[PDB]
């Protein structure tokens, strides 16, 4: 649902690079440049942002129980 | 102008525009709309008295109080209601209006659902998922899918060869009227084996075969030239006449109509005593049950003579070996019954019983003599409970299955499922094989395996099952376009002219069929008189023009190629790019006569091209009379085979295996799983969209409800724990959230007070008062006998505290152990107004030694062992694999698509892209992927020097490692040890 | 070989023998119509049945898009360069794989095998 902390393979914290990735993609940076700007060098870490589907943004459309 | 190299993006704008308009359950929804808008009305108006018109409300619920309040589909799901709209009719005697006769279940997101035009915001204010496709019924809480049952086409003459029996050849014709008032009535016309080979006609409601000339004299064609003029259209064919000579002799004794009608009636079901009564019996059996699609009237006899002469002539053409015998597996010869035909067939019987019972009731009152009072004479539960029962149960068996909600692809693949029957027609054909005619219309890969291999099928992606139409506009146009009827002609002209059938019934003859086909096509390519789903085949050698407006003809869109140039010019693509704020959609492309719908028997007169860019370019000529073009050749694949990347590099057993395992991968199955108390939901924590993805996945919504995670996979023999299909998992990755899952289960119970005493009631049993057989543990219940959300329930622990009163206990325990946490406890009232409770418990599932994982290239394996990150073989960058799989799995399975997926996935993760694994690309090699992998500083073939994690030493052979999309199959092991 | 039809009731004329002159009559069995035959043959069974398929193929097939066209086979009648070849595909002569051509020019439709 939500960006994982910690790239699964290596353990590097990618969980504070999701809003930065989105902000750098809306400022017209190709995804390969947005990922180099966040300092994600190993492809194991770049697939964590490259291939993430933000579903918590769709689950926040249904009104809470209270 | 033309599109020369911009094709591969033009190709996919045209497909995006298709799926923007239609969607993927369009056949279900269009079929139910046709049922509920046309067939219910023409069913009440084909009832012999009287009922005037039909109104259908929006689905409404009345409580025990009594008040019309709308029901939303979620309140129907939760409270176990049926999502059904009331049906009102106008009856006349005074006259009554809106007389309620029953409740009809409403297919979700169809025109009569409360969720029909709602935007995605107001779909979320109702707690419905905006991606849910709809196309199922909510019946007693359950979501039911009407599987599309395939069957043989009616109204057409099929000449087969009886292997042995006593007939060398047999030509059958299942006939059914326009509005299928009475079921189909098959007539056979066989030619005995071996005077000579006489022809016999096996009529319905007649126990013996009848010489064919007897049936031609019973129609009133007494002479013998006036029987061969209907059978042999060219008398100068001496070879065909000597085949009918042996049969104009078996009927030599009978030379008049009434002695022939007697000959026939003497064989009926009720052999009457009177010659006149037997004559009248045979008269009405030939007048109503023989070839009803030709007509049921007092003058439809020179049309039944023509049609029976056609069946005989076509049997002779087969026996003379002048026409191929008919293929029983060809899909031009099949029709798919969807929710429209199935439910209209189910509603004929129930309206019939409603009439029967209103008569049986009102008769008592008015022959008593008081008064009838029609409006309590109506037992609405006839219609209501008949529809509801036949949908809830599936017995119409195997229609109406529970909708599969394991993945989104499992769901979408359930709503596009066909079903070849294995009844008498499955006994005569080869129904389990892939026929040539399934091209583009059924997925060649997606089939079950085991006992139903090849019997259950799935639509291709752009395949559309036609919904039905009325032939009356076409019949008027044909009359107006110089077509001669089958009464204003002399069978001397019928010889070198072109038959003209419309929906099976031979309608006329035409003397210029070329110009007629041009005209009919030009009209269908403008949607003037002929709707777009109308089939128009021309048998040039057989001299026939068959025109179909049936319901159930599976078809598919194709680009039109006039001469040798596509009609899809660059301006259509420019207008479709701006599909928003332009109102230029698929239908503005159909209506522009640039895309056509071709069905499986119109598809035999066409000359398709695969690609414009290659096929219609001048070269050493293969074909230069192309008439259509494929949009994209990968639209021949279904929903679950459109997930496989590079499927033209796997062997088809692997495409089939994966098609079956894409329906078991966990993921997110629907966005509002937070409100849905299904039994058994599986939700992955961190799903990921694939890094190597098909272009046909943009339309399956697989970037939004994806089912799996991109693993780093090393193909390497590490410690032997990946022996045959097992894999070695990283224990540190698994600690970091890799492939973790949630498993929800709901338990319902209701507080039924059925009898006078022995009322069940929710109450904390334990050691309260009047105890019975209290078992292990009853202390987590609250005082209302229900457990509260957020408590941890273990094995053999009590969930609902029900006591069936000196009170016995019938409490609900967890399903034999799982130690979950109570997630949600909803309390409501069922239809009966009794208390009702659904309790959902939640269990987190971390991958283990038994759990099964599988790639998108069709082989699944348990997890042999899990090594921590420091035990895994690392790279000179510290990239330990997430999965290590065995090398000796790859070769035997032809899945080079797995290695190309790893290579393309490595390039995509380094490049910052998402790679194109679309099947028939030709702009994506392995050499082009390798030359890009060798630009990010890797070995061009994806190998990588790995080090041993135990001893630190390099591994002598370089290991093939890279990111591959892996699925966590629904199986696991927590489900077996409990 | 063919069927003869009566001239009064239009039923079928069956062969019978004329004793007094010993000549083959065709006589109807619903009338007293008779007709001195001209064939002196009653029944012909062709078991080997060498058949002409140049006579079954109608020229309208030159309007088939799915049929292969040709250029190095001009029609002998009209000299039109193009043609449209195909095979028999008939349970009787399905054994051989002989090609028939149908001149494709309009108004000609001249069939020929080679
Ligand atoms: Zn990493
Ligand atoms: Zn006669
Ligand atoms: Zn010619």
From Swiss-Prot, chain C:
PROSITE patterns: RNA_POL_M_15KD (PS01030), ZF_TFIIS_1 (PS00466), ZF_TFIIS_2 (PS51133). Zn(2+) 1 binds at residues 6, 9, 28, 31. Coiled coil: none annotated. It is found in: Nucleus, Nucleolus. The keyword Protein biosynthesis does not apply. One of its GO terms (cellular component) is nucleolus. One of its GO terms (biological process) is maintenance of transcriptional fidelity during transcription elongation by RNA polymerase II. InterPro entries: DNA-dir_RNA_pol-M_15_CS (IPR019761), Rpa12/Rpb9/Rpc10/TFS (IPR012164), Zn_ribbon_RPB9 (IPR001529), Zn_ribbon_RPB9_C (IPR034012), Znf_TFIIS (IPR001222). It comes from the Eukaryota. A zinc finger (C4-type) spans 6-31. GO terms for molecular function: DNA-directed RNA polymerase activity; nucleic acid binding; zinc ion binding. The keyword Transmembrane helix does not apply. Keywords: Acetylation, DNA-directed RNA polymerase, Metal-binding, Nucleus, Transcription, Zinc, Zinc-finger. Zn(2+) 2 binds at residues 75, 78, 103, 108. A zinc finger (TFIIS-type) spans 71-113. Belongs to the archaeal RpoM/eukaryotic RPA12/RPB9/RPC11 RNA polymerase family. Component of the RNA polymerase II (Pol II) complex consisting of 12 subunits. PANTHER family: DNA-DIRECTED RNA POLYMERASE, DNA-DIRECTED RNA POLYMERASE II SUBUNIT RPB9. DNA-dependent RNA polymerase catalyzes the transcription of DNA into RNA using the four ribonucleoside triphosphates as substrates. Component of RNA polymerase II which synthesizes mRNA precursors and many functional non-coding RNAs. Pol II is the central component of the basal RNA polymerase II transcription machinery. It is composed of mobile elements that move relative to each other. RPB9 is part of the upper jaw surrounding the central large cleft and thought to grab the incoming DNA template. This is DNA-directed RNA polymerase II subunit RPB9. It comes from Sus scrofa (Pig).
């Amino acid at each position: 649902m939500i960006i994982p902390v910690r790239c699964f393979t290596c353990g590097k914290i990618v969980g504070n690079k999701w809003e930065a990735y989105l902000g750098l993609l809306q400022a017209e940076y190709t995804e390969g440049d947005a990922l180099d700007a966040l300092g994600l060098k190993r492809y194991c870490c770049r697939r964590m942002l490259l291939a993430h589907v933000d579903l918590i943004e769709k689950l926040l459309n249904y009104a809470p129980l209270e | 102008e033309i599109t020369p190299d911009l094709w591969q993006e033009a190709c996919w704008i045209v497909i995006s525009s298709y799926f923007d308009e239609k969607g993927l359950v369009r056949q279900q929804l269009d079929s139910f709309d046709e049922f509920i808008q046309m067939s219910v009305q023409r069913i009440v108006e084909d009832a012999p008295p009287k009922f005037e018109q039909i109104y259908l409300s929006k689905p409404t619920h009345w409580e025990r109080d009594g008040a019309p309040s709308p029901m939303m589909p979620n309140e129907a799901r939760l409270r176990n209601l049926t999502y059904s709209a009331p049906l009102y009719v106008d009856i006349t005697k005074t006259q009554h209006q809106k007389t309620f006769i029953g409740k009809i279940p409403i297919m979700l997101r169809s025109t009569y659902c409360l969720l029909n035009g709602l935007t995605d915001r107001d779909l979320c204010e109702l707690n419905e998922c905006p991606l849910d496709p709809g196309g199922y019924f909510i019946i007693n809480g359950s979501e039911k899918v009407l599987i599309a049952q395939e069957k043989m086409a009616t109204n057409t003459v099929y000449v087969f060869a009886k292997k042995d029996s006593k007939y060398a050849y047999t030509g059958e014709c299942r006939s059914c009227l326009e509005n299928s008032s009475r079921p189909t009535s098959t007539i056979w016309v066989s030619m005995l084996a071996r005077i000579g080979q006489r022809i016999v006609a096996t009529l319905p409601y007649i126990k013996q075969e009848v010489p064919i000339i007897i049936v031609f004299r019973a129609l009133g064609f007494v002479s013998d030239r006036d029987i061969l003029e209907h059978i042999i259209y060219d008398f100068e064919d001496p070879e065909m006449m000597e085949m009918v000579k042996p049969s104009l002799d078996e009927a030599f004794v009978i030379q008049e109509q009434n002695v022939a009608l007697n000959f026939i009636g003497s064989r009926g079901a009720k052999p009457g005593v009177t010659k006149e009564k037997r004559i009248k019996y045979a008269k009405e059996v030939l007048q109503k049950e023989m070839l009803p699609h030709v007509g049921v009237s007092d003058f439809c006899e020179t049309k039944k003579a023509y049609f029976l002469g056609y069946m005989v002539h076509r049997l002779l053409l087969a026996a003379l070996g002048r026409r191929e015998l008919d293929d029983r597996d060809h899909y031009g010869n099949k029709r798919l019954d969807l929710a429209g035909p199935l439910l209209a067939f189910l509603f004929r019987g129930m309206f019939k019983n409603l009439l029967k019972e209103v008569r049986i009731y009102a008769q008592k009152f008015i022959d008593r003599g008081k008064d009838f009072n029609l409006e309590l004479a109506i037992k609405t539960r006839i219609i209501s409970d008949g529809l509801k029962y036949s949908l809830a149960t599936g017995n119409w068996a195997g229609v109406s299955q529970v909708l599969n909600r394991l993945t989104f692809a499992s769901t979408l693949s359930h709503l596009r499922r066909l079903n070849s029957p294995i009844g008498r027609d499955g006994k005569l054909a080869k129904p389990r094989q892939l026929h040539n005619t399934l091209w583009g219309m059924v997925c060649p890969a997606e089939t079950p395996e085991g006992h139903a291999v090849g019997l259950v099928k799935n639509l291709a992606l752009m395949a559309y099952i036609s919904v039905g139409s009325q032939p009356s506009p076409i019949l008027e146009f044909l009359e107006e376009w110089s077509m001669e009827n089958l009464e204003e002609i002399s069978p001397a002209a019928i010889a070198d002219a072109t038959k003209i059938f419309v929906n099976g019934c031979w309608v006329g003859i035409h003397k210029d069929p070329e110009q007629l086909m041009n005209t009919l096509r030009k009209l269908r390519r403008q949607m003037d008189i002929i709707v777009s789903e109308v089939s128009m085949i021309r048998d040039i050698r057989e001299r026939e023009i068959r025109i179909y407006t049936d319901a159930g003809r599976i078809c598919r869109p194709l680009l039109i190629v006039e001469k040798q140039k596509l009609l899809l010019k660059k301006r259509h693509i420019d207008q479709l790019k701006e599909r928003e704020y332009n109102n230029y959609s698929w239908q503005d492309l159909v209506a522009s006569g640039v895309v056509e719908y071709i069905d499986t028997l119109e598809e035999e007169t066409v000359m398709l091209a695969m690609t414009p860019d290659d096929l219609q370019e001048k070269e050493v000529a293969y074909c230069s009379t192309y008439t259509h073009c494929e949009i994209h050749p990968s639209m021949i694949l279904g929903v679950c085979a459109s997930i496989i990347p590079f499927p033209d590099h796997n062997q088809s057993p692997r495409n089939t295996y994966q098609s079956a395992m894409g329906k078991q991968a966990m993921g997110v199955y629907i966005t509002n799983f937070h409100v849905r108390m299904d039994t058994l939901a599986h939700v992955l924590y961190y799903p990921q969209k694939p890094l190597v993805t098909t272009r046909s996945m943009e339309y399956l919504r697989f970037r939004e409800l994806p089912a799996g995670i991109n693993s780093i996979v090393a193909i390497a023999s590490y410690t032997g724990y990946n022996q045959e299909d097992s894999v070695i998992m990283n224990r540190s990755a698994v600690d970091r959230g890799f492939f973790r899952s949630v498993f929800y289960r709901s338990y319902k119970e209701q507080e039924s007070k059925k009898g006078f005493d022995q009322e069940e009631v929710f109450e904390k049993p334990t050691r309260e008062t009047c105890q019975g057989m209290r078992h292990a543990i009853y202390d987590k219940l609250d005082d209302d006998g229900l457990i509260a959300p957020g408590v941890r329930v273990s094995g053999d622990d009590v969930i609902i505290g029900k006591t069936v009163t000196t009170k016995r206990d019938c409490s609900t325990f967890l399903r034999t152990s799982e130690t979950g946490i109570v997630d949600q406890v909803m309390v409501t009232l069922n239809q009966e107004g009794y208390k009702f409770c659904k309790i959902r418990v939640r269990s987190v599932r971390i991958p283990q030694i038994g759990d099964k994982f599988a790639s998108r290239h069709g082989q699944k394996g348990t997890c042999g062992i899990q090594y921590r990150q420091e035990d895994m073989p690392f790279t000179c960058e510290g990239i330990t694999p997430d999965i290590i799989i065995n090398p000796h799995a790859i070769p035997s399975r032809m899945t080079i698509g797995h290695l190309i997926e790893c290579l393309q996935g490595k390039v995509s993760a380094n490049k910052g892209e998402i790679g194109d694994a679309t099947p028939f690309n030709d702009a994506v090699n392995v050499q082009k992927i390798s030359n890009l992998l060798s630009d990010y500083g890797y070995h061009l073939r994806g190998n990588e020097v790995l080090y041993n994690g135990f001893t630190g030493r390099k591994i002598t052979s370089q290991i093939f490692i890279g990111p591959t999309y892996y699925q966590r199959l629904k199986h696991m092991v927590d489900d077996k040890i409990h | 070989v063919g069927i003869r039809f009566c001239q009064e009731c239009n039923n079928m004329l069956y062969p019978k023998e004329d004793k007094e002159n010993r000549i083959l009559l065709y006589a109807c069995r619903n009338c007293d119509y008779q007709q001195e035959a001209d064939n002196s043959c009653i029944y012909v069974n062709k078991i080997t049945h060498e058949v002409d398929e140049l006579t079954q193929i109608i020229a309208d097939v030159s309007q088939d898009p799915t049929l292969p066209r040709t250029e190095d086979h001009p029609c002998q009648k009209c000299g039109h360069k193009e043609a449209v070849f195909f095979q028999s595909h008939s349970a009787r002569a399905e054994d051989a794989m002989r090609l028939y051509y149908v001149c494709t020019a309009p108004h000609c439709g001249h069939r020929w095998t080679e």
